[PDB]
Design a binder for this molecule. Structure first.
Ligand SMILES: Cc1ncc(COP(=O)(O)O)c(CNC(CN)CCC(=O)O)c1O
Ligand SMILES: *Cc1c(COP(=O)(O)O)cnc(C)c1O
Ligand SMILES: NC[C@@H](N)CCC(=O)O
Lengths: 427, 427
């Protein structure tokens, strides 16, 4: 196993971009510091610049639920780029997708497209405040909603992986209106409303965590966040950027039957292109310009290509057996992964909901960021590098949920299980 | 001239999205409402859903400097999407583009890609503050850097340092550190530094305005913004999202020989895909994660499709005669447009630089937003609708710069001039 060519390229990138990457995590710091450069991806696999093949479990971080470079998605894209890659004006495709999204997500009866999760989240945070008139907001430690000032305090992803604290470059005045609290803790939330009466606009959270490792809500937690927000006439926001169209067609809100006021989307609806969206309760969206006073703009927003990738992606996902298959194989890997660690005598706790899972080096049980932080990071490091050499590509971080796609076969699951047994055995 | 099909579609979008558009301007509210829905675009033209053909001067708002659906750009894209539309990891293409961007823009010796102008500007704003440690920022009335909350500050005499939020949903605390002032006003800037000693991190601006109509800097203004910032050891930031690779290969900073500390890019470097970038002075970028402590990350940032469209786009722009041709025809349209208004007897002014121009229905001359606000909007409204019927597509706003592409022929310019004479004549 060699990565000479990746090493060369990455060494050069460090002189061209910050950390030689376009996003922090890709740096591998928290797992070695030697990231691998990709050349192509197909179905459930990824290929080195050194020619190494991998069974990918990162799926470009969520977008590839139908598999990498899906035949029908690419075809729909080629045909589409013939008519232009961007108009900067209205097009029929926006309507189609808007419609599909409305039909898909319950709380969503009116949506607005953007270009990334960060845009959606910073805009939903604004509408959150514009509608209610209150400045303060409540988020959970470990959760992630993009690199927007307000959210940069007890964030997730990279800042929740390789050290990294709140700020810097964010005025204290900013993060002041942001109330943080431990995940899966209704009481902690109930207190934040008491300490700040009439000041909390609403609560935002990942209906299921993926930015602190895989973390699912406890019984009555979501149901509870819905009761307390209503009680204080405050909004409940679901950041389904990662979970949207993955945990279920209608996201976590459809699967666990909890309807929020507003919800953010991204990743999967882009089918592999930069796309985002924030929508929901009609009467709240009307505040969005040019319908309402809340200004929010985007230049490449609703562009033909992205609207096409998304249309085609949701269409593939409407096929029968989609989610059933995903949960089927995802259950095999998780159970099998925790089964293997138990045999090699390594403390670990996993879990999964559909084609999304988690695997912490700590027995748990994990309910919040703190619990998750007990993971043996030095272990995961050796484990991650291990899998890599065995031909398995996993998120270069302990605090990142795992993903599967419709392109992952029963064999891939078994092959991943094999390599895992090999790696852990020598851990 | 009919737009029944566009009316139908837009009527439906208003029930699906806020204002029935993905971005405010698209709603045509400042031109009498009722926008036109596109179906396809090729070279310098655009086509209705009703079949109407137009000589487009919006160019999807900047990205199409090589023309709509450029043959070599599309070909480079198809070939590329075969290897995947997004990896979520490092790839050789990021290095290529980063390199090209570094060679291109002077101030830029290290860059970071993002997905839109808004991401670049909000991140450059953060790095601006993180490097200097100061919270306050100075921008100009009329300029635009995206809907990031701090830029959603009310501008105009009587409220410069009042930092009042010109949009609901954004707290007062945030815009409080946003000091504003009239474009092309060195003294107004010199005062802001006196009233706020040691608190101003830097100045951000459009090296050439495009978001208040076309507005170019007066002699010594940019050179001046560079002296005063150095004097107070503060950063000078050039938002070249619109101007980058359009006013010149190296943007305004190369053409007018003024080098800033940091500079934002977008639009053209995406070749028609959602792309963004903020870079510059090496020692300042190192603060960007994972190199430094400031956090910023994007899931799609650095995706191969966008990196490919951008690579190919800059390559076409490196050909000989590129900018010379652009300035050649853009000069023909501007001069000819002002020549026509003079004849029809219309109060008008404006001009052009490379493939960017402006046209105000006022005697001016124009040096800032106020000056520009004197434009007869009711006139532009009838003028805009007029051009539309004659087969010309212009930005549905008086405060938006005009654009041309390498795909615009001498004939197109002459035909636009023709329709203009026709329209103004009956204005
Ligand atoms: C100098 C400058 N800086 C930042 C931006 C914001 O870029 P985007 O986030 O919207 O890609 C822009 C955006 N420009 C336009 C068209 N003039 C946005 C399109 C719209 O608002 O409809 C800009 O001109
Ligand atoms: C991935 C993620 C984001 C970040 O979205 P970007 O497009 O990278 O800005 C935001 N929220 C959640 C829940 C995510 O998983
Ligand atoms: N939950 C965080 C990841 N989607 C990170 C994606 C990236 O930055 O590339």
């Amino acid at each position: 196993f060699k990565t000479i060519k990746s090493d060369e390229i990455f060494a050069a990138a460090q002189k061209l971009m910050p950390g030689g990457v376009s996003s922090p995590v890709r740096a591998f710091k928290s797992v070695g510091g030697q990231p691998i450069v990709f050349d192509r991806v197909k179905d459930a696999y990824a290929w080195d610049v050194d020619g190494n093949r991998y069974i990918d479990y990162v799926g470009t971080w969520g977008p590839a639920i139908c598999g990498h470079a899906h035949p029908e998605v690419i075809e729909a894209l080629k045909v589409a780029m013939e008519k232009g890659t961007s108009f900067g004006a209205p097009c029929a495709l926006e309507n189609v997708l808007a419609e599909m999204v409305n039909d898909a997500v319950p709380s969503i009866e009116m949506v607005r497209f953007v270009n990334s999760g960060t845009e959606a989240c910073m805009a939903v945070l604004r509408i959150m405040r514009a509608y209610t008139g209150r400045d303060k907001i409540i988020k959970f430690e470990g959760c992630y909603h993009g690199h927007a000032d307000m959210f940069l305090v007890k964030a997730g992803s990279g800042v929740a992986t390789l050290g990294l604290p709140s700020s810097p470059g964010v005025p204290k005045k900013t993060t002041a209106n942001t109330l943080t609290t431990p995940y899966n803790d209704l009481e902690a939330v109930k207190a934040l409303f008491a300490e700040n009466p009439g000041e909390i606009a609403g609560v935002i959270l990942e209906p299921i965590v993926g930015n602190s490792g895989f973390i699912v809500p406890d019984a009555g937690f979501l149901e509870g966040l819905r009761e307390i927000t209503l009680e204080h006439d405050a909004l409940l926001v679901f950041d389904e950027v990662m979970t949207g169209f993955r945990i279920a067609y209608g996201g976590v809100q459809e699967k666990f039957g909890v309807t929020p006021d507003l919800t953010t989307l991204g990743k999967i609806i882009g089918g592999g292109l930069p796309v985002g969206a924030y929508g929901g309760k009609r009467e709240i969206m009307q505040l969005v310009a040019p319908a309402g006073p809340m200004y929010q703009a985007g230049t490449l927003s609703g562009n033909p290509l992205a609207m096409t990738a998304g249309i085609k992606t949701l269409e593939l996902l409407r096929q029968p057996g989609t989610y059933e298959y995903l949960d089927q194989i995802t259950k095999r890997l998780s159970d099998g992964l925790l089964a293997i660690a138990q045999e090699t005598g390594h403390a670990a706790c996993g879990g999964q909901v559909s084609g999304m899972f988690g695997f912490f080096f700590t027995e748990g049980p994990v309910h919040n960021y703190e619990d998750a932080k007990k993971s043996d990071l030095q272990k995961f490091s050796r484990f991650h590098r291990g899998m890599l050499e065995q031909g398995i590509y996993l998120a270069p971080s302990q605090f990142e949920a795992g993903f599967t796609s419709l392109a992952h076969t029963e064999e891939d699951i078994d092959a991943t299980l094999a390599a895992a047994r090999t790696v852990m055995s020598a851990l």
